């Protein structure tokens, strides 16, 4: 919960940057997560990316952060074989569905 709270805070403090930093040129700029990283691009782009962000409602960012957390957890096969990984996956699913519900209503 503290990791997901800090992720939400980090996006909130990126919200104070320039509105159109996501439109800068670059080969790797994380376009999948740039919809969530810069909400303010929809103001300048009335028809380029505002409707895409409204209709798509990107919640795969939660899946990518869950994959990052899976990369950040210890690779213990004893937990994976036992139900400890089951409880860890259940609590991770609860925290990520809460986090996805947070990112769901960002268009209001």
């Amino acid at each position: 919960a503290q990791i997901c709270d800090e992720a939400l805070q980090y996006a909130a403090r990126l919200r104070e940057l320039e509105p159109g930093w996501s439109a800068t040129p670059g080969c790797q700029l994380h376009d999948a997560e740039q919809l969530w990283l810069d909400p303010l691009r929809a103001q300048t782009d009335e028809t380029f990316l505002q409707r895409r962000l409204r209709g798509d409602w990107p919640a795969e960012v939660g899946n990518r952060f869950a994959n990052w957390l899976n990369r950040a957890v210890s690779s213990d096969s004893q937990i994976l074989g036992s139900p400890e990984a089951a409880q860890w996956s259940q609590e991770l699913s609860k925290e990520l569905t809460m986090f996805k519900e947070i990112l769901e209503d960002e268009r209001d």
């Binding site: 080969c27 790797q28 376009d31 895409r52 798509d56």
Partner: protein
């Protein structure tokens, strides 16, 4: 005391090349030297949602709203030219020999015992059954994985090369030789003798393998599929890319080698499925299961350990499987 080594790396025999795809017309196979190559092409696809939902996405309003925005993708596709019904797939195969000698080992006593075991096998039962099965998988176009599943006629030609010229040529009908039975044929016997001479170290064996499959005018062929780093947008997702070397659709060499290794008809489960690729723990990706589990003591590692350390020679079929595993190579030997 003869404990097994911590590193037992083996180099692969039966080295296959990348198999290139070109296309043309049937009865022009004798003049198929300058056939145009099959080129990987870009096309745009749009589809509706068809995956299973997890009982929470089954809301009709949400499903209809998802259909209002169908996914847009671009994919790589390989097709024949419209004036061409035959697929030509050509690769080369080197048969090396020296299967039982590891490329890396720790224990010299284990290496000597394993080489003695392999020499005992070769003396008692040479590379004959294995070579017959390899020649069978080479004479039926199993390396044409999805390219012969619905072909009207599949015809493969095997040539033997010494000085850049054909030393002996083989002509086969790949639909007559099925994907199931390892029968006996005089041309197949000669090809098996050549593979045996290659695997025994008697001489150099280089074979070019050209397979012709009459599929249809402008039909879709199926080359090897690569991976995508997925660093683009959601419109041009590039969800599918195909393998090519120089603007020519190709099949990965390891896929051809996997199709050539499909000789294992000795796994404990019922052989109604047919042959499977020779590999430790008999793990086929299609069914996602492992024939020759270590629990039933018929995997490669337990058989090799019993044959070499305890001198418990398995059945001739199981030692054929073990020597085929030595032929395919590997990084056998844990810490």
């Amino acid at each position: 005391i003869l404990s097994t080594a911590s590193v037992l790396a083996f180099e692969r025999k039966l080295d296959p090349s990348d198999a290139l795809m070109s296309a043309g017309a049937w009865a022009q196979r004798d003049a198929s030297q300058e056939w145009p190559a099959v080129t990987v092409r870009e096309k745009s696809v749009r589809g509706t949602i068809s995956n299973r939902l997890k009982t929470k996405d089954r809301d009709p309003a949400k499903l209809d709203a998802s259909i209002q925005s169908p996914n847009l993708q671009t994919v790589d596709v390989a097709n024949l030219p419209s004036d061409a019904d035959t697929l030509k797939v050509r690769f080369t195969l080197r048969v090396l020999g020296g299967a039982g000698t590891p490329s890396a080992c720790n224990d010299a006593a284990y290496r000597d015992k394993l080489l003695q075991t392999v020499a005992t096998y070769v003396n008692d039962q040479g590379f004959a059954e294995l070579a017959r099965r390899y020649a069978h998988n080479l004479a039926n176009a199993r390396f044409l994985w999805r390219n012969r599943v619905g072909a009207e006629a599949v015809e493969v030609r095997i040539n033997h090369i010494r000085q850049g010229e054909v030393a002996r040529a083989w002509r086969f009908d790949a639909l007559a030789i099925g994907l199931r039975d390892f029968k006996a044929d005089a041309e197949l016997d000669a090809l098996a003798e050549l593979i045996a001479s290659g695997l025994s170290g008697s001489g150099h064996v280089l074979l070019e393998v050209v397979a012709f499959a009459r599929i249809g005018d402008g039909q879709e062929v199926f080359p090897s599929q690569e991976l995508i780093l997925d660093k683009g947008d959601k419109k041009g997702q590039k969800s599918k890319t195909l393998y090519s070397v120089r603007d020519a659709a190709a099949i990965h060499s390891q896929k051809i080698g996997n199709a050539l290794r499909t000789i294992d008809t000795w796994y404990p489960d019922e052989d109604g499925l047919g042959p499977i690729a020779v590999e430790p723990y008999g793990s086929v990706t299609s069914q996602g299961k492992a024939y020759r589990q270590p629990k039933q003591k018929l995997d490669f590692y337990t058989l090799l350990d019993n044959w070499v350390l305890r001198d418990e020679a398995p059945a001739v079929e199981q030692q054929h499987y073990v020597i085929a595993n030595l032929i395919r190579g590997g990084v056998f030997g844990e810490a």
